[PDB]
């Protein structure tokens, strides 16, 4: 078989959704990401994920 480098060949996370308008709000020491296109809301901590 043809050999390819490991790092640019595999992905442990896969792109699922693209959101044009995902409103971000800061509330209760958390970030709320709300999308009306998919009617979906996520809650995250205020700190970035490296």
């Amino acid at each position: 078989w043809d050999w390819v480098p490991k790092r640019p060949s595999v992905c442990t996370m896969t792109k699922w959704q693209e959101v044009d308008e995902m409103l971000r709000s800061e509330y209760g020491g958390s970030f709320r990401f709300s999308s009306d296109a998919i009617s979906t809301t996520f809650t995250t901590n205020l700190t970035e994920y490296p």
Partner: protein, 50 residues
């Protein structure tokens, strides 16, 4: 002396204002994290295909 239109005299409001707007109609689309085919494909070997 003369006649006057109703608009000629400034009016003070004797009504208390109450503003209500309706809830907007929303549409929920079919959205799944993983489909049936992706979950089936997750397996490394399939006995039937092999």
């Amino acid at each position: 002396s003369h006649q006057l239109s109703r608009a000629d005299i400034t009016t003070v409001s004797t009504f208390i204002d109450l503003n209500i707007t309706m809830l907007e109609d929303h549409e929920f689309v079919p959205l799944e994290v993983y489909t049936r085919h992706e979950i089936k494909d997750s397996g490394l070997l399939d006995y039937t295909e092999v």
